[PDB]
Design a protein around this nucleic acid. Structure first.
Ligand SMILES: [Mg+2]
Lengths: 107, 82, 17, 95, 98, 98, 87, 95, 107
DNA sequence: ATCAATATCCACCTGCAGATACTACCAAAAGTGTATTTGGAAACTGCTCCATCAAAAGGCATGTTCAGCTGATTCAGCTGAACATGCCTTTTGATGGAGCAGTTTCCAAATACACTTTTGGTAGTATCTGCAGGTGGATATTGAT
DNA sequence: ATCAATATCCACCTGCAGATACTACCAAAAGTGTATTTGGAAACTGCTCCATCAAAAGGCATGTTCAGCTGAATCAGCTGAACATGCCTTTTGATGGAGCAGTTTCCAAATACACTTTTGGTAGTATCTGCAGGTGGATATTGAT
């Protein structure tokens, strides 16, 4: 008889949990039915976007397992994700290869 | 053969951090300047962390004390909880 | 997969390249 | 021996739709957990401000949407808004 | 008898360390430094292992970021050698003081 | 006919503008600029007069602050003349741009 | 009705002299000829970003009037908190 | 004419305590009003979070106090903490 | 025998107001009796610090009425208030007189 | 050019650390059924924002002129990069107990309600006054000589 | 080190704009003082995981030799400051028009709440394997000649 609010909304992310985390969070006295559905979809979408590009970067390294380095390379190579995460450190991410042109040897 | 803990942050270690930052050549005064900056960073973050520890009436600094400190210092760290 | 992902992704223009 | 909830189950399912032959390290999964929790906090926080500014007791789909427009850059916002409207469309059409 | 010219090993370390993600400071010295600084705020402290690592991750990412800005401040002055004045300008414009 | 040397009036103007707090952009042009940009986001918008003055106070305090950092960038280069590359190095280090 | 006169090129209303005064308050003694066009670009980007957020709060409120408060909230979001206009 | 409230009255009291012969323009009063509202939010925000971080549902003077130690620099913290401990101890031992 | 909680605590700043603003602000489910007293005190302390120093800038500039410029000179001349307010713009406050030494003339 | 030293690159291999997979147990999501709360829809204000215009300071545009700044060039001296060793510090891996966190228990404290009382806002009115803006005249600064 | 052009200083002298200070005044909010709920400090205890401490291992301190970078001195071109001159556009202070924020009252949805039914997600556990090393040999890079 029971069907998860997620299976109804077409999501892998837990609508039920998002709803509870909104309540136990002191964000507002009340919480509209759709708010946790929307919010769950947004977080899923952004997760797909990152796992998509992290996947591609793992593929380029002849690798099947996404590591933090793959997450860093995807995020910092994307203008929008890099801005969203502009004040965030990926542990064990390292940096993009970048050597200022004038530091390159002459011949 | 005893020496300060800060000097435990060695010229070669600082050289490696520089190199990951893309730096080709390094003045000898960089090593002490960098120790200075590091000390202030750790001071400002460990202070906030410890203030979370004291608040929770604990005698152990948790990963979360550090993560919560890093966040309010505008250095949000991912991968240690939160 | 089944997500409306971004068609194109541009890189950020870094100062000093 | 108490329950320590995370998003890992959900991160893993989205991985499989998107890269079905691709795995993910413990450390990488920790980073995706931080990610979800962080954007959860930012969006919920902006939605709370919006409701507060408009003397409203309630965070609806609309505060989430406005919050997403304020917080996501350009194309991310557009696609997030469309994934969000879609999920709320599907869910309002489910007996 | 064959000797690499000044800056040829420097480029190689850059390429090498920009490719890797390992922490670049030896753990024990850093653990000792953490405990010292922390002693001054509350004595008899213990640290989760993950606490100290969080701190080393954050502290290394910070110093690498600062070296990049520092490097841009040196190159802006038509140099290739980072100096205290470069670190100090980067901190001033970042708003970390002055 | 007696000329001040180059720099003398520029220093008089620094002293005079650093002493005062009046907005330095003409009110009406700035209001036309706000209306145009807003109209390009949404048609049929009106503005409380205080909304435009808040924008003007925020835009001037931002531009003044940016010129201080820009000036520090020129001086670091051993110049006294701010150039486009100073403003952009400053914005890069402020984290306003990549 | 009347319909509004067309608004074009108003960025040029931020004159060389208005930019000189701002540079003076900022401590600047000498100014490259290219600074004026560089500043107009930086100002447009700053205004667009704040106006975009202010108008988002306007639209969410279902109003046709951008309030001081809409600007003050946009400035706070952008980490440019302004005192003296409410909030 | 809907009652819009501010901290003006209290700012002006405290002005009269410290500089008995000094006035304050309405713009300056506008700024002081923004300043109190801003520090209120920042302290209340740290306190909210601090409570959440410790699975508590009550903001006590203990959460305010830690929030003050996180937000104010050294000396302003010290004096702020004194005035707040003093106001509380008093308020309690005045009943 | 109606005492204000402000009088009970020995404060100019309104404890009742502050109790309420903590209520309607959704900071937490519940609010201790001390919280609003401690917070009203702190706010009062800080507004006393600022008005003391701004008063002094008023007198120094041969004036009787504190204007925004007096608040800006007070805040920017105090190391601690300057850091607390380092990301805040004071409308009609202007800046501190300050010329970089190399810009000054002569030898 | 050539020649060699060393770094770098790709294919293959393989042990196990660190993944993926599996299960039962229960906290927490969903289902149902009353129990409250809200957030438009309608219907009016007055507030205030747009508009448009007239007259006049006030600042803007443009052209001329040359002071002095930037940036190209050269060059000497010093200051950091490189590099060859062994020893000293860190890393690794194996035990005692601090103290985190698990949990239940009961009271001091906070909520809920609905009274009564007082504060703080405002509108209105007048009532006072600090200071901006102006004007000389005495005094300081700058740049020619 | 003399002088004159012209900027700046400061003390007088106004007329309000804007501040202060009455009201009277009321409406919403803060306070009062029981009725009800419950969150969190308290005390106990178990079992992680944190500190300590002794063999295994490579990273770093060191001093020397010199490549090439930094910064000093010089110089010429030409950009940007100063300023004089002409005048367009902004500022200012009205008036009238209305669009639209802002209120206040019915409520029919919408969400909270209290209780019960169900199952998704976690924590042990129990397997499976991606890949970090390691080796071998080819080729590229760098710097000497
Ligand atoms: Mg347009």
């Amino acid at each position: 008889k029971a069907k998860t609010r997620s299976s109804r909304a077409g999501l892998q992310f837990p609508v039920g949990r998002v709803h509870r985390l909104l309540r136990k969070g002191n964000y507002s006295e009340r919480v509209g039915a759709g708010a946790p559905v929307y919010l769950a979809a947004v977080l899923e979408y952004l997760t797909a976007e990152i796992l998509e590009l992290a996947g591609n970067a793992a593929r380029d390294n002849k690798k099947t397992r996404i590591i933090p380095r793959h997450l860093q390379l995807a995020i910092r190579n994307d203008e929008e994700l890099n801005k969203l995460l502009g004040r965030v450190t990926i542990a064990q991410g390292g940096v993009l290869p970048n050597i200022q042109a004038v530091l390159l040897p002459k011949k | 053969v005893l020496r300060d803990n800060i000097q435990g942050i060695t010229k070669p270690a600082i050289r490696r951090l520089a190199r990951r930052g893309g730096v080709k050549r390094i003045s000898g005064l960089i090593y002490e300047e960098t120790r200075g900056v590091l000390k202030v960073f750790l001071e400002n973050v460990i202070r906030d962390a410890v203030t979370y520890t004291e608040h929770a009436k604990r005698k152990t600094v948790t990963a979360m004390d550090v993560v919560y400190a890093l966040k309010r210092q505008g250095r949000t760290l991912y991968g240690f909880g939160g | 997969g089944g997500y409306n992902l971004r068609p194109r992704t541009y890189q950020p223009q870094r100062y000093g390249g | 021996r108490s329950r320590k909830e995370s998003y890992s189950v959900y991160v893993y399912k989205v991985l499989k739709q998107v890269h079905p032959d691709t795995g993910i390290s413990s450390k990488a999964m920790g980073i995706m957990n931080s990610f979800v929790n962080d954007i959860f906090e930012r969006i919920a926080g902006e939605a709370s401000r919006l409701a507060h500014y408009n003397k409203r007791s309630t965070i609806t789909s609309r505060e989430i949407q406005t919050a997403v427009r304020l917080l996501l850059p350009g194309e991310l916002a557009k696609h997030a808004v469309s994934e969000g409207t879609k999920a709320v469309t599907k869910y309002t059409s489910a007996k | 008898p064959h000797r690499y010219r000044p800056g040829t090993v420097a480029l190689r370390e850059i390429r090498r360390y920009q490719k890797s993600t390992e922490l670049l400071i030896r753990k024990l010295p850093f653990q000792r430094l953490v405990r010292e600084i922390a002693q001054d705020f509350k004595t008899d402290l213990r640290f989760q292992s993950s606490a100290v690592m969080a701190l080393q991750e954050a502290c290394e990412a910070y110093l690498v970021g600062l070296f990049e800005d520092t490097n841009l401040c040196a190159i802006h002055a038509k140099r290739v050698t980072i100096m205290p004045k470069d670190i100090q300008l980067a901190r001033r414009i970042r708003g970390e003081r002055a």
